[PDB]
Amino acid sequence: KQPWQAKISVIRPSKGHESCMGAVVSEYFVLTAAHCFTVDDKEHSIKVSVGGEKRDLEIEVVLFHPNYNINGKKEAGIPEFYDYDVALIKLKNKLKYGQTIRPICLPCTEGTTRALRLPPTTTCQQQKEELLPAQDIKALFVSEEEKKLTRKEVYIKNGDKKGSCERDAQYAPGYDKVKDISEVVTPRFLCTGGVSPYADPNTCRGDSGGPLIVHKRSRFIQVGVISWGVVDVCKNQKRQKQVPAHARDFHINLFQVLPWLKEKLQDEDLGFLA
Amino acid sequence: SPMYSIITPNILRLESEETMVLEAHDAQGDVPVTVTVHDFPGKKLVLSSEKTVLTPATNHMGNVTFTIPANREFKSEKGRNKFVTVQATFGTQVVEKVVLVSLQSGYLFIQTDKTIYTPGSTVLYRIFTVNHKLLPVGRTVMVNIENPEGIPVKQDSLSSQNQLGVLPLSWDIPELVNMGQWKIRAYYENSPQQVFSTEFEVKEYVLPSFEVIVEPTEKFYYIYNEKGLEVTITARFLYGKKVEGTAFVIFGIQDGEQRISLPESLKRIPIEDGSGEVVLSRKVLLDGVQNPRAEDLVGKSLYVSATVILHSGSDMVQAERSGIPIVTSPYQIHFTKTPKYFKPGMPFDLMVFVTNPDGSPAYRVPVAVQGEDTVQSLTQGDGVAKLSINTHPSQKPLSITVRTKKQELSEAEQATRTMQALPYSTVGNSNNYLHLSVLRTELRPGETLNVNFLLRMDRAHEAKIRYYTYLIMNKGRLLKAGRQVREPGQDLVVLPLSITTDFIPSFRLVAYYTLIGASGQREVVADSVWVDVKDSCVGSLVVKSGQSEDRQPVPGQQMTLKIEGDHGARVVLVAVDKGVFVLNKKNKLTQSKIWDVVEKADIGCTPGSGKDYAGVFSDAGLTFTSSSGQQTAQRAELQCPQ
Amino acid sequence: TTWEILAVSMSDKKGICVADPFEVTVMQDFFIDLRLPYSVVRNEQVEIRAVLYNYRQNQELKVRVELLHNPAFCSLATTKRRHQQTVTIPPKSSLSVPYVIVPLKTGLQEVEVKAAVYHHFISDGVRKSLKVVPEGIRMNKTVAVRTLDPERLGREGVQKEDIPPADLSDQVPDTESETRILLQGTPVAQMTEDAVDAERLKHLIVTPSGCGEENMIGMTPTVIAVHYLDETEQWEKFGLEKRQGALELIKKGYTQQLAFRQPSSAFAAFVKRAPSTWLTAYVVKVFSLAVNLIAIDSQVLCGAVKWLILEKQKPDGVFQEDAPVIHQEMIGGLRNNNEKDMALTAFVLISLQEAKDICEEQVNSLPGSITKAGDFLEANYMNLQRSYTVAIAGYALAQMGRLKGPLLNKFLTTAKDKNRWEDPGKQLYNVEATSYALLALLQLKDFDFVPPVVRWLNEQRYYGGGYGSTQATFMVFQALAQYQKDAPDHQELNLDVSLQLPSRSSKITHRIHWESASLLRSEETKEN
Amino acid sequence: ISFHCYDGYTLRGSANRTCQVNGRWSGQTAICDNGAGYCSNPGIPIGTRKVGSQYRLEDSVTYHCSRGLTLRGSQRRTCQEGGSWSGTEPS
Ligand SMILES: *[C@@H]1O[C@H](CO)[C@@H](O[C@@H]2O[C@H](CO)[C@@H](O[C@@H]3O[C@H](CO)[C@@H](O)[C@H](O)[C@@H]3O)[C@H](O)[C@H]2NC(C)=O)[C@H](O)[C@H]1NC(C)=O
Ligand SMILES: *[C@@H]1O[C@H](CO)[C@@H](O[C@@H]2O[C@H](CO)[C@@H](O[C@@H]3O[C@H](CO)[C@@H](O)[C@H](O)[C@@H]3O)[C@H](O)[C@H]2NC(C)=O)[C@H](O)[C@H]1NC(C)=O
Ligand SMILES: *[C@@H]1O[C@H](CO)[C@@H](O[C@@H]2O[C@H](CO)[C@@H](O[C@@H]3O[C@H](CO)[C@@H](O)[C@H](O)[C@@H]3O)[C@H](O)[C@H]2NC(C)=O)[C@H](O)[C@H]1NC(C)=O
């Protein structure tokens, strides 16, 4: 049901195992978050598994976005800074497409234009009006429930509820004394979760780096990468059945990182728009 | 001995700039002042801190501005009232006072496009977010929409940041929905106790093609008028043309909310050329209550309902005019703008307010005090007449009864009202007073106002008086403060005051002087006055036809609309059919309704003076504290007494 | 008609200004006015009136007016025949044209009427719409009203409620039915008691004076009164402004108490007197609660603790009294010598835990001594007899989290009538014992045993002050001040209400909190 | 002809449309939507008439062309689960 889902494992010297996730975007690249890895983590200590396979695939290089800096706000008293929290993982071996391993489509490409049944003259600004309009957008992400993958349907607060969603970042750990709330929430972000209009399931720490998918006309398009959350409702025992109302989760908008994605995937036959 | 003083408003507001005045009497050389603001209780954090120096060249003055920070210390809702520890240090002397703080961040006004809606339509509504100075600001606002039962249906949490203080919103009406009076409530996130609301009706209807105005010949009804009550029925189309047809008009009496109809008064008149006349006779009215005495109908009101039907039979309109009170006198007298405290030996200025029985002011009505008849003041366009009487230097309460001397009317049909004024308690019975009288006319922006200072005291200590100190209160904030000099021998000095657009709608003016006479004690005598300005816009906004009149335009034709307003202003528009106001003329957004909300949120209660010197400040909405021990009373209620 | 244009401007410098209404009159000379009702019933023959107006000055019109055919209506206008008549309208008059129709299908249908005049190029047409509501009377039926409360009505934390379908055997043929489901949370308002009135506490502002122990009998009702009035917010009904006069009396007793401090960092009644274990420990209890009002030095408070840990603490954790105080009325329930090793150790251990967050960096043996003193109270807690010694040793064990098992059951059952832990003897010790056990009930966060305990302390109306009232004024207004801060206004509302329908595939889940309560969450379903 | 919505509404589709030589308007259909329904606003194609202002779940809309014109597409569309109208857009 979820062929694109990658399971990433990073072994660190006595720090523990970092259980992150990613998305198969091509035959060589796996898109995920950037805070799962640091500069000290070497390529022999990072193992990625896809398709439910027992073996681990070996990687070549982890390509971070050039604007990522997690400790870039320690002068202002902010310990974390998840702006531009995306990274690509170039694998060593080519992936063979079958029934359990298939890619996920990306914004502003040739195949995305035909998947929405649009004319080929559709610009990239016209596609951003289609997938992310100024309303509450129905979406879904992939989570791991008792060694089994399941889907959690959420709503993207992009309309008038975008203001009520973003101002709830003051309750995050370390962000309790942040002056301007827009300093930590750049326009590169999307907001899901909360109580209005529905009770959305929240993302865990193990679901980090996964895709934020939009199901339209029996096809699945990724529009975001899971970044960080205000409240940790998952404790690896169950899901905490009494969540608060300001438990929101933030993602990285893929329409804002397009010149970096077009450069790193220029030799992949994806067909990005001009 | 040098004296240090501090003046601050009664209630300080969150996230707003308040003004602070520092003085130093009988001092030479510069006095450095360090002012530090703390929260109550215990002084946990510094909320504000400012510094200034009082130079003798400025006569030891210096206005200081601060701002209550938007910190989460005022987060508790069980506290009801909030307080701060205000502290000022004059070099080596520390002066402090506890001041009440309200949680209010400003005002919220809700505009709807129509006053009545059908099921299936969509309601458009804007929210204008301003602070206490009527300037736009960005806050977080919670919005509710309530049913006729009072249960909220849809809740939102918007921010007016980066939107120029205008929040466009919408709500769809389902096809199956409850009719009745719906409600839209909104409040600031930091002040949830202050809710602002506007209603609208939901009904199944169609639009009419003509309006019916039911207006009687007088705005009341006199009991002994043998002619009865004459009511004019006006019926014209929406486009201005006149209506031919037939009407059905019936009168009725109303006592409280229990209505008693009068079926004896049914008439059927034809409506010719959009006009018609109908009279209720007095014998029909006295036969409906079964009352042999005619004096028991005083207090009750009358209501008229009309139903005009066209000659084609295609449409009809019901209209109603209610609240026509039955009175013995066509005028009423209210001392609601007149001070309740006087000074013995000095002239007392009465602010007489004369109304029609429906609430409108009366034009050109003589007003003379019963038992005196010296001054016969005439009413202006605002319904205010200016009287003055000479008083004896006695501490007896002054009973003033004021009547009207209108001609073409007998003395039994004249109005009267008696009020009681209490004497001003002096400091130590020294008989040192101060009166403030102002030329009462309609004040417009751009004019100049002559404010008079009258001093009554003994001659042994008038040479010590060299200056007065005036302060301007407007919309709960301090606007301007200065000095007014006086030489020994001058019993009267005049301050010319320029009137800007910032005094709208009204303003209060306080003043005080300070000196030491006989024993070495600092004496403070004060006085206040409330002056109304013409309630108009701060800027201006006119909408007229950009096309040079032409003729009445055709359906489908383009026209040019001229929008005339201030620079850098976001103008929002709405165009409404005038057939909507036939069904519901309630809940229209006007400029006069906006100034009614601002005037009913002022921190001053009594329109003039007080029982003592400290009672003048608390009734006008100010706090005083000095280094010599003289303070004002505490204030723990956000609203006025009673 | 006439349009009334209202405008509002918004300048950042000038502010708000709503314009006067500007009226634009729109009119034609020859037009049709189609006057239609709000709704007509399907298959009911009604008559509609198309009024033709002629506002010309002195020109009569010859007009052919025709109704257009619609398949949703049944009139005389068909597909192969026009329903047109020609009439004559005099000047400055109107003529009504009657038309009969029968609507045939529900929904919003359309009617169009056109007309044109003879020998001139003037014409007009009106196309308006009207609702065709189906036959019958609108009705509603209540299927169920069920009160939702898991754990009470439910089991294991979940509650399942099954809803049957409706009746609808009397439904109109070929009509739409809509089912509305509503969720509504109920607000709760629990706990909270009336605080002791500040008009009853005027007599507690006492100027302290005397020796090393007579200073503390005067310092006690002044320090504890400011602590109680700052939390309950009763400075308005006390009179205000007298806070600064009471803040100077607290600084007066702090200065006189340091004059009897020994060079061993301990306190006695005189400088030539031997140092005392109780007076040094009661100074720590008063000074740690006085850090919120004035200034407190770190070298005297922790030095009193360091003298209590290194000099006057056995490795058992038992604090032994060397020289007792001269004033035996100020010690309260410690005057009765029954279990001196369990009551004096519990008295100092509260002073070490109320100064635990102050002296954690200076005295490194304080996390050790708290562990050493807490282990002695846990062993002999099952052997205590007096109701005061259980209350004083229950609050010393609750601040760490070690009042569980057979020790927690002995703490709750000692209360006679479940409201007071009175001893058989001494009224002052029973008044003090209820406030020690109330402070242990608020540290455990067990809010069920609390409201009968607070209600007994307020109905007794002990306002403090007097001889021997040093412990009795200090503890009753410490527990009643701790009550007003830990009191909730409501119990939890967090309802994970999911709705599974067999018509859909997804579960419709709402979470109702306290702030979003009293807000209906309607979910409409046209399938029964 | 050009399209422009009221305040608080988002315009999707072609804002500027042009009548071509084949008697059809260029671009996509302009839709003013507020984002309050489970399904989006199906909009009004030029020449049609939409009956149904509610855009909730399980709702339906019916379309009718003008006089002498033939409907192509679905006369009735129904909002399905997932936020997608049944049938096809008429013309
Ligand atoms: C507090 O005091 C300061 C300094 O006295 C005030 O600043 C002054 O504000 C006025 C108003 O903008 C400035 O212009 C003046 O306007 C009047 C208008 O009638 C005119 O007659 C004067 O000749 C003058 O041009 C003035 O330049 C400015 N600065 C100084 C040094 O006076 C401030 O307004 C006061 N604030 C409050 C709240 O009282
Ligand atoms: C659907 O069910 C309701 C039952 O609640 C039916 O009765 C309606 O009930 C409401 C609530 O009590 C009434 O509203 C109220 O009317 C009174 C006047 O009696 C007014 O003073 C209140 O302010 C409030 O508006 C409503 O009138 C009433 N409807 C009636 C009497 O026709 C309702 O009739 C049912 N609807 C249908 C279509 O069957
Ligand atoms: C759709 O087409 C319209 C034209 O049909 C485009 O409107 C153009 O918008 C620009 C604004 O960037 C206009 O410039 C301004 O014009 C006003 C005229 O009053 C002038 O005062 C300003 O100084 C400024 O120059 C431009 O005139 C206008 N084009 C025309 C022909 O009037 C619109 O941008 C198009 N939108 C899309 C999404 O394609």
Residue numbers in the entry:
A (entry chain F): 492 to 765
B (entry chain A): 23 to 664
C (entry chain B): 800 to 1327
D (entry chain F): 127 to 217
Relevant lines from the article:
Structure determination of macromolecular complexes is challenging if subunits can dissociate during crystallization or preparation of electron microscopy grids. We present an approach where a labile complex is stabilized by linking subunits though introduction of a peptide tag in one subunit that is recognized by a nanobody tethered to a second subunit.
Whereas the binding mode of properdin to C3b is preserved, an internal rearrangement occurs in the zymogen factor B von Willebrand domain type A domain compared to the proconvertase not bound to properdin. The structure emphasizes the role of two noncanonical loops in thrombospondin repeats 5 and 6 of properdin in augmenting the activity of the C3 convertase. We suggest that linking of subunits through peptide specific tethered nanobodies represents a simple alternative to approaches like affinity maturation and chemical cross‐linking for the stabilization of large macromolecular complexes. Besides applications for structural biology, nanobody bridging may become a new tool for biochemical analysis of unstable macromolecular complexes and in vitro selection of highly specific binders for such complexes.
